[PDB]
Amino acid sequence: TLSIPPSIQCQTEAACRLITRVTGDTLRAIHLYGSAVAGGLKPNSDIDLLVTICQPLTEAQRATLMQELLALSSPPGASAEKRALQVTVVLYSQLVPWCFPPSREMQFGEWLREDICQGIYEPAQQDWDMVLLITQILETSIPLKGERAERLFTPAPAAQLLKALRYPLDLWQSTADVQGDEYHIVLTLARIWYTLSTGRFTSKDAAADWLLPQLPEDYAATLRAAQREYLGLEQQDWHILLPAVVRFVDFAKAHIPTQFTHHH
Ligand SMILES: CN[C@@H]1[C@H](O[C@H]2[C@H](O[C@H]3[C@H](O)[C@@H](O)[C@H](NC(=N)N)[C@@H](O)[C@@H]3NC(=N)N)O[C@@H](C)[C@]2(O)C=O)O[C@@H](CO)[C@H](O)[C@H]1O
Ligand SMILES: Nc1ncnc2c1ncn2[C@@H]1O[C@H](COP(=O)(O)OP(=O)(O)OP(=O)(O)O)[C@@H](O)[C@H]1O
Ligand SMILES: [Ca+2]
Ligand SMILES: [Cl-]
């Protein structure tokens, strides 16, 4: 039985209590997922939460939830006891039965603090990553509210999981597509490659270790630098590394499988 890390139990309980109070009778479930449960919880890591609701939130509820989550969350790395929160809200009707691509009602995150602090909220929108979120939750998650994931959601067809995995791959193209997110994108490409090759999901760090000995050394050096920064061991100048990041992205677009090698 998967366990909530003691060091996030208090904050996680407070988030669960807030989400429960604001959503009320529409709440179907709350699931903890991501590196807190699957492994690889770093000092800058956020706490990943999926909220499943039955009906869309009112305009006032969205504002209440967004504003109060701001007070429960801190920028990543600002505090060892008050982590960044990521809260994704989805309609049950978008997942059972599946809609492809599924829509997400709402997303809270620290990368939106400046907008959210002004009352600017993302509307409901289509998100291919929701297929990957649910797939990961089906394997590794904890129900803070409601039923365990395997009793609530069904697996997506492999054909849709493939499309969800390759969607960001086709979108990363230019220097500006990757600028500001260099090591994140390099590591996520490693996780995508891993999943398409083995059918499984794994941590950012472990995916980098899996891919490294398979790469020509020039691409291994870029992956090693992204891994080393993510592990907090060295902050690179990613403006100098940008051309090598672009080459890494192109290499992954050329070499990552176009079909599962080993389904999920
Ligand atoms: C939804 N989670 C947050 C989000 O992550 C995103 C992150 O997405 C980033 C793209 O790579 C980048 O090319 C894109 N850059 C562009 N020039 N388009 C970013 O804008 C995008 N970030 C974003 N929408 N907040 O890369 C994806 C693989 C992701 O992990 C999930 O869809 O954005 C990250 C910051 O960019 C946050 O750290 C995450 O918590
Ligand atoms: N093959 C993949 N395996 C895992 N995550 C993937 C994959 N492809 C894309 N992603 C997406 O990348 C994002 C990773 O989430 P997130 O950045 O919170 O990472 P994490 O594993 O929880 O680590 P961290 O401790 O840095 O938060 C999710 O949106 C996830 O769906
Ligand atoms: Ca996370
Ligand atoms: Cl860990």
Side-chain angles (χ1 to χ4, degrees), residues 4 20 32 37-38 43 46 61 68 70 82 85 92-93 100 108 116 161 165 168 182 203-204 224 226 233 245 262 264:
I4 299 171
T20 296
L32 177 70
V37 188
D46 52 4
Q61 289 177 303
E68 295 227 54
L70 277 176
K82 185 167 176 182
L85 298 178
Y92 180 79
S93 52
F100 294 110
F108 174 93
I116 296 173
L161 181 62
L165 285 158
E182 295 86 354
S203 67
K204 289 167 180 179
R224 278 192 316 260
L233 303 176
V245 171
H262 296 44
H264 175 67

Side-chain angles (χ1 to χ4, degrees), residues 46 86 107 111 122 127 129 168 171-172 176-179 181 184-185 188:
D46 52 4
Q86 185 181 15
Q107 200 166 57
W111 73 93
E122 287 188 339
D127 190 351
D129 190 61
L171 181 142
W172 288 311
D177 293 336
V178 302
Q179 193 281 324
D181 287 284
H184 182 66
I185 288 170
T188 299

Side-chain angles (χ1 to χ4, degrees), residues 40-46 75-80 82-84 230-232:
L41 183 70
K42 308 299 191 174
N44 293 339
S45 292
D46 52 4
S79 169
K82 185 167 176 182
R83 290 179 178 271
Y230 178 80
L231 298 173

Side-chain angles (χ1 to χ4, degrees), residues 33-36 38-42 44-48 83 86 107 129-133 136 164-165 168 172 184 188-196 200-204 230:
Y33 73 97
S35 67
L41 183 70
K42 308 299 191 174
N44 293 339
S45 292
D46 52 4
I47 297 169
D48 300 322
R83 290 179 178 271
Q86 185 181 15
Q107 200 166 57
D129 190 61
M130 180 64 61
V131 182
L132 306 184
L133 296 189
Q136 291 169 262
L165 285 158
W172 288 311
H184 182 66
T188 299
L189 288 166
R191 299 181 87 179
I192 288 168
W193 203 325
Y194 176 84
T195 297
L196 281 165
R200 305 195 34 97
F201 295 86
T202 202
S203 67
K204 289 167 180 179
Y230 178 80

Side-chain angles (χ1 to χ4, degrees), residues 14 17 22 31 55-56 70 82 87-88 99-100 136 155 157 170 180 198 213 223 234 238:
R17 276 196 328 270
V22 181
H31 290 93
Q55 286 90 25
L70 277 176
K82 185 167 176 182
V87 182
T88 309
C99 296
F100 294 110
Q136 291 169 262
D170 301 319
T198 72
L223 177 58
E234 180 185 358
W238 288 102

Side-chain angles (χ1 to χ4, degrees), residues 80-221:
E81 292 77 18
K82 185 167 176 182
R83 290 179 178 271
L85 298 178
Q86 185 181 15
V87 182
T88 309
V89 180
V90 66
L91 291 175
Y92 180 79
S93 52
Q94 284 292 300
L95 307 173
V96 180
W98 278 94
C99 296
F100 294 110
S103 164
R104 61 159 144 92
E105 275 296 299
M106 194 199 82
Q107 200 166 57
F108 174 93
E110 282 292 337
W111 73 93
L112 302 168
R113 172 173 288 272
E114 305 316 306
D115 281 349
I116 296 173
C117 229
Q118 287 179 345
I120 307 180
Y121 312 135
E122 287 188 339
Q125 67 196 75
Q126 137 186 147
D127 190 351
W128 268 112
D129 190 61
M130 180 64 61
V131 182
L132 306 184
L133 296 189
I134 298 302
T135 299
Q136 291 169 262
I137 289 174
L138 277 172
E139 187 184 327
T140 304
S141 63
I142 295 175
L144 311 174
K145 280 275 177 186
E147 279 192 288
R148 68 187 74 162
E150 55 269 39
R151 289 186 174 168
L152 192 61
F153 312 115
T154 71
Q160 304 307 308
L161 181 62
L162 170 68
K163 282 176 59 163
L165 285 158
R166 291 196 50 97
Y167 193 80
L169 181 61
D170 301 319
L171 181 142
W172 288 311
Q173 302 193 6
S174 67
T175 300
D177 293 336
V178 302
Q179 193 281 324
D181 287 284
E182 295 86 354
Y183 66 79
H184 182 66
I185 288 170
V186 171
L187 294 173
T188 299
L189 288 166
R191 299 181 87 179
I192 288 168
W193 203 325
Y194 176 84
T195 297
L196 281 165
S197 286
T198 72
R200 305 195 34 97
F201 295 86
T202 202
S203 67
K204 289 167 180 179
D205 183 29
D209 280 339
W210 174 88
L211 179 58
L212 274 167
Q214 314 181 60
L215 294 180
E217 163 60 21
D218 295 341
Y219 302 97

